[PDB]
Design a protein around this motif. Structure first.
Motif, PDB file in Angstrom:
ATOM      1  N   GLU A 166      13.926   4.310  27.432  1.00  0.00           N
ATOM      2  CA  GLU A 166      12.851   4.318  28.447  1.00  0.00           C
ATOM      3  C   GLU A 166      13.417   4.510  29.840  1.00  0.00           C
ATOM      4  N   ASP A 167      14.531   3.836  30.134  1.00  0.00           N
ATOM      5  CA  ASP A 167      15.123   3.997  31.464  1.00  0.00           C
ATOM      6  C   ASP A 167      15.552   5.417  31.740  1.00  0.00           C
TER       7      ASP A 167
ATOM      8  N   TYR B  34      14.802   5.792  19.000  1.00  0.00           N
ATOM      9  CA  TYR B  34      13.362   6.025  19.078  1.00  0.00           C
ATOM     10  C   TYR B  34      12.584   4.998  18.275  1.00  0.00           C
TER      11      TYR B  34
ATOM     12  N   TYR C 150       7.120   6.658  20.397  1.00  0.00           N
ATOM     13  CA  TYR C 150       8.176   6.640  21.431  1.00  0.00           C
ATOM     14  C   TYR C 150       8.539   8.060  21.837  1.00  0.00           C
TER      15      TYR C 150
ATOM     16  N   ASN D  90      14.145   8.145  30.459  1.00  0.00           N
ATOM     17  CA  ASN D  90      12.969   9.000  30.643  1.00  0.00           C
ATOM     18  C   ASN D  90      12.184   8.704  31.911  1.00  0.00           C
ATOM     19  N   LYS D  91      12.331   7.516  32.450  1.00  0.00           N
ATOM     20  CA  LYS D  91      11.616   7.207  33.699  1.00  0.00           C
ATOM     21  C   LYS D  91      12.565   7.394  34.884  1.00  0.00           C
TER      22      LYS D  91
ATOM     23  N   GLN E 154      15.203   0.148  25.474  1.00  0.00           N
ATOM     24  CA  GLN E 154      15.130   0.047  26.940  1.00  0.00           C
ATOM     25  C   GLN E 154      15.950   1.162  27.592  1.00  0.00           C
TER      26      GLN E 154
ATOM     27  N   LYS F 125       6.183   9.519  24.610  1.00  0.00           N
ATOM     28  CA  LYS F 125       6.383   8.899  25.940  1.00  0.00           C
ATOM     29  C   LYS F 125       7.793   9.151  26.460  1.00  0.00           C
ATOM     30  N   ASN F 126       8.767   9.436  25.615  1.00  0.00           N
ATOM     31  CA  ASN F 126      10.176   9.528  25.993  1.00  0.00           C
ATOM     32  C   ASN F 126      10.810  10.763  25.362  1.00  0.00           C
TER      33      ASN F 126
END
Length: 191
Positions: A168-169, A150, A56, A171-172, A165, A59-60
């Motif tokens: 992830e939100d 994480y 994680y 980082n995106k 979630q 990616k984040n």
């Protein structure tokens, strides 16, 4: 290759510790850091715990966490220094562009993966800056929350999924990221 960051071999010589047991390595690592009052020290199993956090983190790699005091927001940044060395840096968000003294992370954590393949162990050392108003206890609680967001140490509960979630939100750059929910989920005792 005289790296600008310290690796495990700079603290414990790998060629010296290779035939030690997992427990003997853990004793030596804790002894190494024992003369300090600014240090965070842990030994983490790789497959069971660190691997999922690592996946994680790649990616984040950026997050924000509150430090309850009101709350003070902190940046969390994962930095991949090398194949066996992963850093987690925690910096106070409000002041980090004000002066070089505040621009430094108050907490830096190293995870060493050099023994992950042979002993399924990750060695962690972190330091909290004495000039900061973050205590060792505050840093411990932030690190616990880094773990919860994480990968939520493999939990599959609804709230663990809500934490992942949100990570992830953030980082995106999703509109669904919300500071209020962040603060609620960081303060919630459920795992």
């Amino acid at each position: 290759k005289d790296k600008p960051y310290k690796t495990l071999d700079d603290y414990l010589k790998l060629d010296k510790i290779k035939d030690l047991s997992k427990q003997e390595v853990e004793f030596l690592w804790r002894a190494k850091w024992s003369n300090r009052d600014d240090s965070l020290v842990a030994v983490v199993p790789y497959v069971k715990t660190f691997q999922g956090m690592y996946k994680y983190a790649v990616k984040n790699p950026l997050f924000v966490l509150p430090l309850p005091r009101p709350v003070e927001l902190q940046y969390v940044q994962w930095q991949f220094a090398g194949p066996n060395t992963v850093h987690c840096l925690i910096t106070s968000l409000a002041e980090y562009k004000l002066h070089q003294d505040f621009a430094k992370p108050h907490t830096t954590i190293q995870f060493h993966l050099d023994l992950a393949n042979d002993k399924d162990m990750v060695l962690m050392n972190g330091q909290v800056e004495s000039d900061s108003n973050v205590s060792l206890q505050d840093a411990q609680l932030l690190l616990l929350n880094v773990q919860r967001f994480y990968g939520a140490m493999g939990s599959e509960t609804s709230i663990a999924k809500e934490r992942i979630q949100l990570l992830e939100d953030f980082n995106k750059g999703s509109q669904n990221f919300d500071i209020n929910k962040l603060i609620q989920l960081a303060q919630s005792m459920e795992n």
